[PDB]
Structure formats: structure tokens, C-alpha cells
């Protein structure tokens, strides 16, 4: 499904103080700055290069 079964994705420090807590469309908006499109349904990409 295209984001409609996820509340949010995140990347936490220790178990506390999240660093990128985003809904599945703001998450896909950061992917569109990377690969100029978005991945197929269900695939979520996180860049840490």
C-alpha cells in the first residue's frame, strides 16, 4: 500500500530524542529530492550518505 498502513517512520537515538519522525508523505518527499521519483508501493528509503 502507498503509505496508508503506516502512521510514521522514524530514526531514533538511544530510545529517546527522534531525529527524523515523518508521516509517509513527508518521508516520500525527502526521497523525491534524492531519486527524482518515489519507490514502488511499500518501499521506504532512508538516506544517510
Amino acid at each position: 500500500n502507498a503509505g496508508t498502513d503506516i502512521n510514521y517512520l522514524s530514526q531514533r537515538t538511544a530510545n529517546f530524542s527522534d531525529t527524523r519522525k515523518l508521516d509517509p508523505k513527508t518521508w516520500a518527499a525527502q526521497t523525491r529530492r534524492r531519486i527524482a521519483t518515489d519507490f514502488p508501493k511499500g518501499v521506504y528509503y532512508c538516506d544517510n550518505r
Partner: protein
């Protein structure tokens, strides 16, 4: 470089809940010994030659000889008996 509000000042930071203090401390990562593997060959069959080249070609020469030089039958002039 903020200015202190004298009408509504505030104090220093109070304690807040914390992030489980050992989980902010990392392990020191433990390197084992390593090896560039295999026995290396001494030389490589390179796709290009490793020497200089020449931009222009120069003409080379070699000396040759002529032959045995012979005599000749010349056409001989007339005698200068005051006509010449």
C-alpha cells in the same frame, strides 16, 4: 547575547526525564587482525606500452656507392689558329 527581561525573568534548567544513560555510551569496536590475501604476481601483461612515442617521423638514410668510373670519348675542339 540575550537581554535579561527584568519583569519576567527565568531560572536555570530543571531536571527532565533522561535517555537511559548506558544507551548513550558506545562500545569500543574491537578490531581483529587482517591480511591482504593471496600471493601477488610480479608483473602484469599491460594493455599499453610503458615507453615514449614519437610525434613526427624522420626520414632515415643509408650511404650507397656509385660504381667504377670509366673514361670517355670527348668531342674535341679545333686548334686556335687565330680563328676563335
Amino acid at each position: 547575547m540575550a537581554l535579561i527581561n527584568p519583569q519576567f525573568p527565568y531560572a536555570g534548567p530543571v531536571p527532565i526525564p533522561g535517555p537511559a544513560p548506558t544507551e548513550t555510551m558506545p562500545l569500543l569496536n574491537y578490531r581483529v587482525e587482517g591480511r591482504i590475501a593471496g600471493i601477488q604476481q610480479a608483473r602484469q601483461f599491460m594493455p599499453f606500452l610503458q615507453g615514449p612515442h614519437r610525434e613526427v617521423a624522420e626520414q632515415t638514410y643509408y650511404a650507397i656507392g656509385t660504381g667504377i668510373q670509366m673514361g670517355q670519348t670527348f668531342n674535341q675542339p679545333l686548334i686556335n689558329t687565330q680563328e676563335g
